[PDB]
Amino acid sequence: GSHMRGPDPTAASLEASAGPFTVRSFTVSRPSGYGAGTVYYPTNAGGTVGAIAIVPGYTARQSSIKWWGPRLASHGFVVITIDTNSTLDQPESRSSQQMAALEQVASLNGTSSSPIYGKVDTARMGVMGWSMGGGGSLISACNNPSLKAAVVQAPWHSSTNFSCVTVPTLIFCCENDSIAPCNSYALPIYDSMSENAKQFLEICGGSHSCANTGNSDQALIGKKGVAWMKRFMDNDTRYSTFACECPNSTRVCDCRTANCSL
Ligand SMILES: [K+]
Ligand SMILES: [K+]
C-alpha cells in the first residue's frame, strides 16, 4: 500500500531497459568506509524509496555491476554501486563496506544540499552483489535481518552454510561458471536457507560474468531483480507473480523457489 510506486507492472514494462522514473547519478565525493561510490536515484518516484547497495566481484570494479544502477533506479530505488577499498577484499570486508555504503546513503538523505535529500526511506534497504560481493550480501543479511531483500549473482563465499539468512533472497547463477560453479556455491547456498522466501535461477550458457554489465539477458535478469526488490522492499503484491514465478524462457536452465506465493 503506502510503499507502492509507479504504474501497474507488465512483463513488457519489466523487460524494457528502463522503468517509469527519470534517473540521475553522482559520484560520492568522500566515500566513508569503502573505496568509491556512484549513487543512482529516481528524480520523480512520487514518494520516498528504499535504498540498495551493490558490491562487485573479486578483482572487479563498479563497471561490472553498474547496469543495475539505472535499471533499478528507474523503477523506484536509490542505488549505490561501490568500489571496494581493494579489488582483492574478501566477503567479510565486502559486507562491512556494503553496510558503510548504506550508512552514507542515510547521511546524504539527511543532507539538505545532497541530490538525494529526503528521497530515501532508511527503514527499507536491500543488498546485492556479484561473486564475493554476493557472498558479502548474504553476510549482510545474516547480521542485519531487517534488510528487506537480497539479490545476488554467482555468489562466492568460503562457506556455503547460510542457514542464518531470514531475508528474502534471489540467487542468480550462470550455467557454465567455472569460478563459482552452481553445483558447489550458489546451489548449496540456496539449499542451506530454511527460514525465508527464496529463489534460485540458473541462466543458460553463462560464464561467471553472465549477470554483469553488457550481458545479453538483461530483459530476464532485470525483470527478475526489479520484481524481487519491488515485492520485498516495497511489500508490493502487484509484483508477487513476477517475483515468485519460474519464467519459461529458453534462457532459464533451472528454477527453484520456496516460501514465495504468486
Ligand atoms: K544515470
Ligand atoms: K560526500
Coordinates of C-alpha atoms and ligand atoms in Angstrom, one line a residue:
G1 CA 0.0 0.0 0.0
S2 CA 1.9 3.0 1.3
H3 CA 5.2 1.9 -0.3
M4 CA 3.8 1.3 -3.8
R5 CA 5.3 3.4 -6.5
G6 CA 4.7 3.7 -10.3
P7 CA 2.2 2.1 -12.7
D8 CA 0.9 -1.5 -12.6
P9 CA 3.7 -3.7 -14.0
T10 CA 3.6 -5.8 -17.1
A11 CA 6.1 -8.3 -18.5
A12 CA 7.0 -5.8 -21.2
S13 CA 7.5 -2.9 -18.7
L14 CA 9.8 -5.0 -16.6
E15 CA 11.8 -6.4 -19.6
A16 CA 12.4 -2.9 -21.0
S17 CA 15.8 -1.2 -20.5
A18 CA 14.2 1.4 -18.1
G19 CA 11.2 1.7 -15.8
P20 CA 8.9 4.8 -15.5
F21 CA 11.1 7.2 -13.5
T22 CA 13.8 9.5 -14.7
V23 CA 17.3 8.7 -13.3
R24 CA 20.2 10.9 -12.3
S25 CA 23.5 9.9 -10.7
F26 CA 26.5 11.4 -9.0
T27 CA 29.9 10.3 -7.7
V28 CA 30.3 10.2 -3.9
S29 CA 32.9 12.9 -3.1
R30 CA 34.3 11.4 0.1
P31 CA 33.3 7.7 0.4
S32 CA 33.1 6.7 4.1
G33 CA 34.4 3.2 4.8
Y34 CA 34.5 1.9 1.2
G35 CA 36.6 2.7 -1.9
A36 CA 34.3 4.7 -4.2
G37 CA 30.6 5.0 -4.9
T38 CA 28.1 6.1 -7.6
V39 CA 24.5 6.9 -6.5
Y40 CA 21.7 6.4 -8.9
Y41 CA 18.3 7.8 -8.0
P42 CA 14.8 8.4 -9.4
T43 CA 14.1 12.2 -9.6
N44 CA 10.3 11.7 -9.7
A45 CA 9.3 8.4 -7.9
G46 CA 6.3 10.1 -6.2
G47 CA 7.4 9.3 -2.6
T48 CA 10.4 8.1 -0.6
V49 CA 12.0 4.9 -1.9
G50 CA 14.2 2.1 -0.5
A51 CA 18.0 2.0 -0.9
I52 CA 20.1 -0.7 -2.3
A53 CA 24.0 -1.2 -2.1
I54 CA 25.6 -3.3 -4.8
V55 CA 29.1 -4.8 -4.5
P56 CA 31.2 -6.2 -7.3
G57 CA 33.2 -9.4 -7.5
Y58 CA 36.8 -10.3 -6.7
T59 CA 39.2 -8.3 -8.9
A60 CA 36.3 -6.2 -10.2
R61 CA 35.1 -2.6 -10.1
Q62 CA 31.8 -0.8 -10.4
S63 CA 31.8 -1.3 -14.2
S64 CA 30.9 -5.0 -13.7
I65 CA 27.6 -4.2 -11.9
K66 CA 26.8 -0.7 -13.0
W67 CA 23.9 -1.7 -15.3
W68 CA 21.8 -2.4 -12.2
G69 CA 22.0 1.2 -11.0
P70 CA 19.9 2.8 -13.8
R71 CA 17.8 -0.3 -14.2
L72 CA 16.7 -0.4 -10.5
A73 CA 16.7 3.4 -10.0
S74 CA 14.2 3.9 -13.0
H75 CA 11.7 1.6 -11.1
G76 CA 11.9 3.4 -7.8
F77 CA 15.1 2.8 -5.7
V78 CA 18.1 4.7 -4.6
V79 CA 21.1 2.5 -5.7
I80 CA 24.7 2.9 -4.6
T81 CA 27.3 0.9 -6.6
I82 CA 30.6 0.7 -4.9
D83 CA 34.2 0.0 -5.5
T84 CA 35.8 -1.8 -2.5
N85 CA 38.8 -0.5 -0.7
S86 CA 40.9 -3.1 -2.6
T87 CA 39.9 -5.3 -5.6
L88 CA 41.1 -8.2 -3.5
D89 CA 38.9 -7.7 -0.5
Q90 CA 37.2 -10.9 0.8
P91 CA 33.5 -11.4 1.6
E92 CA 33.6 -10.3 5.2
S93 CA 35.2 -7.0 4.3
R94 CA 32.8 -6.5 1.3
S95 CA 29.8 -6.9 3.7
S96 CA 31.2 -4.2 6.1
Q97 CA 31.8 -1.8 3.1
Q98 CA 28.3 -2.6 1.8
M99 CA 26.7 -1.6 5.1
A100 CA 29.0 1.5 5.2
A101 CA 27.6 2.5 1.8
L102 CA 24.0 2.2 3.0
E103 CA 25.1 4.3 6.1
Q104 CA 26.5 7.0 3.8
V105 CA 23.2 7.0 1.7
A106 CA 21.5 7.7 5.1
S107 CA 23.9 10.6 5.7
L108 CA 23.2 12.0 2.3
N109 CA 19.4 11.6 2.7
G110 CA 19.7 13.9 5.7
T111 CA 22.0 16.5 4.0
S112 CA 19.9 19.4 2.6
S113 CA 22.4 20.1 -0.3
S114 CA 22.6 16.4 -1.4
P115 CA 20.7 15.3 -4.6
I116 CA 19.0 12.6 -2.6
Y117 CA 17.9 14.7 0.4
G118 CA 14.6 13.2 1.7
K119 CA 14.4 10.7 -1.2
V120 CA 15.2 7.6 0.9
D121 CA 13.1 5.6 3.4
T122 CA 16.0 4.5 5.6
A123 CA 13.9 1.6 7.1
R124 CA 13.8 -0.1 3.7
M125 CA 17.2 -1.3 2.5
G126 CA 18.4 -4.1 0.2
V127 CA 21.7 -5.7 -0.7
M128 CA 23.1 -7.0 -4.0
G129 CA 26.4 -8.2 -5.4
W130 CA 28.4 -10.5 -7.8
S131 CA 30.9 -13.2 -6.7
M132 CA 32.4 -12.2 -3.3
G133 CA 30.1 -9.2 -3.3
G134 CA 27.2 -11.7 -3.4
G135 CA 28.9 -13.6 -0.5
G136 CA 29.2 -10.3 1.3
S137 CA 25.5 -9.5 0.7
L138 CA 24.4 -12.7 2.3
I139 CA 26.7 -11.9 5.3
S140 CA 25.0 -8.5 5.5
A141 CA 21.6 -10.3 5.5
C142 CA 22.7 -12.7 8.3
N143 CA 24.0 -9.8 10.5
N144 CA 21.1 -7.4 9.7
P145 CA 17.8 -9.3 9.4
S146 CA 15.8 -6.1 9.0
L147 CA 17.2 -5.8 5.4
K148 CA 14.2 -6.3 3.1
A149 CA 15.8 -8.3 0.3
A150 CA 19.0 -9.7 -1.1
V151 CA 19.6 -10.3 -4.8
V152 CA 23.0 -11.9 -5.6
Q153 CA 24.7 -13.3 -8.7
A154 CA 27.2 -16.1 -8.9
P155 CA 27.8 -15.8 -5.2
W156 CA 31.2 -16.9 -3.7
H157 CA 31.9 -17.5 0.0
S158 CA 34.5 -19.8 1.6
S159 CA 31.5 -21.5 3.4
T160 CA 28.0 -22.4 2.0
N161 CA 26.1 -22.6 5.3
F162 CA 23.8 -19.6 5.0
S163 CA 21.1 -21.1 7.3
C164 CA 21.3 -17.8 9.1
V165 CA 19.6 -15.8 6.3
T166 CA 16.0 -14.9 7.1
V167 CA 15.8 -12.1 4.4
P168 CA 14.0 -12.8 1.0
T169 CA 16.9 -13.9 -1.3
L170 CA 17.1 -14.3 -5.0
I171 CA 20.2 -16.1 -6.3
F172 CA 21.2 -16.0 -10.0
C173 CA 23.8 -18.4 -11.2
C174 CA 25.5 -19.0 -14.5
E175 CA 25.4 -22.4 -16.1
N176 CA 29.0 -22.6 -17.3
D177 CA 30.5 -20.7 -14.4
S178 CA 33.9 -22.3 -13.5
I179 CA 34.9 -19.9 -10.7
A180 CA 31.8 -20.1 -8.5
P181 CA 30.0 -23.1 -10.0
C182 CA 26.3 -23.5 -9.4
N183 CA 26.8 -27.0 -8.0
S184 CA 29.4 -26.1 -5.3
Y185 CA 28.5 -22.4 -4.5
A186 CA 25.1 -21.0 -5.5
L187 CA 23.0 -24.2 -5.1
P188 CA 24.4 -25.3 -1.7
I189 CA 24.0 -21.7 -0.5
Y190 CA 20.4 -21.8 -1.7
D191 CA 19.7 -25.2 -0.1
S192 CA 21.1 -24.0 3.3
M193 CA 18.4 -21.4 3.7
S194 CA 15.4 -22.7 5.5
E195 CA 14.0 -19.6 7.1
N196 CA 13.0 -17.4 4.1
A197 CA 11.4 -16.6 0.8
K198 CA 13.9 -17.7 -1.8
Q199 CA 14.5 -18.3 -5.4
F200 CA 17.3 -19.9 -7.4
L201 CA 17.6 -19.1 -11.2
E202 CA 20.3 -20.6 -13.4
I203 CA 21.0 -18.7 -16.6
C204 CA 21.8 -20.9 -19.6
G205 CA 25.2 -20.7 -21.3
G206 CA 26.5 -18.2 -18.8
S207 CA 30.1 -17.6 -17.7
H208 CA 30.9 -16.2 -14.3
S209 CA 30.1 -12.7 -15.7
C210 CA 26.6 -13.7 -17.1
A211 CA 24.7 -11.2 -15.0
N212 CA 27.2 -8.3 -15.4
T213 CA 27.0 -5.1 -17.4
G214 CA 26.6 -5.8 -21.1
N215 CA 25.1 -9.3 -20.6
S216 CA 22.7 -10.5 -23.3
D217 CA 19.9 -11.4 -20.8
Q218 CA 19.1 -8.0 -19.2
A219 CA 15.4 -8.4 -20.1
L220 CA 15.1 -11.6 -18.0
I221 CA 17.6 -10.8 -15.3
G222 CA 16.5 -7.1 -14.9
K223 CA 12.8 -8.2 -14.8
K224 CA 13.5 -10.7 -12.0
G225 CA 15.8 -8.4 -9.9
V226 CA 13.4 -5.5 -10.1
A227 CA 10.4 -7.6 -9.4
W228 CA 12.1 -9.2 -6.4
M229 CA 13.1 -5.8 -5.0
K230 CA 9.6 -4.4 -5.6
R231 CA 7.8 -7.4 -4.0
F232 CA 10.1 -7.4 -0.9
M233 CA 11.4 -3.9 -0.3
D234 CA 8.0 -2.2 -1.1
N235 CA 5.6 -5.0 0.0
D236 CA 4.1 -4.5 -3.4
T237 CA 2.0 -7.6 -4.1
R238 CA 1.4 -6.3 -7.7
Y239 CA 4.9 -7.9 -8.2
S240 CA 4.2 -11.3 -6.4
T241 CA 3.9 -13.4 -9.6
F242 CA 6.8 -11.7 -11.4
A243 CA 8.9 -12.2 -8.2
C244 CA 7.9 -15.8 -7.4
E245 CA 7.3 -17.3 -10.9
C246 CA 9.6 -19.5 -12.8
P247 CA 10.0 -17.8 -16.3
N248 CA 9.6 -20.4 -19.1
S249 CA 12.3 -18.5 -21.1
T250 CA 14.8 -20.6 -23.1
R251 CA 17.4 -18.7 -21.2
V252 CA 16.4 -20.3 -17.9
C253 CA 18.1 -23.7 -17.2
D254 CA 17.0 -24.2 -13.6
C255 CA 14.4 -22.5 -11.3
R256 CA 13.8 -23.4 -7.7
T257 CA 11.5 -21.5 -5.3
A258 CA 10.4 -21.7 -1.6
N259 CA 8.0 -19.7 0.6
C260 CA 7.2 -17.4 -2.4
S261 CA 3.5 -17.0 -3.2
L262 CA 2.3 -16.0 -6.7
Ligands
K1 K 22.4 7.7 -14.9
K2 K 30.3 13.1 0.5

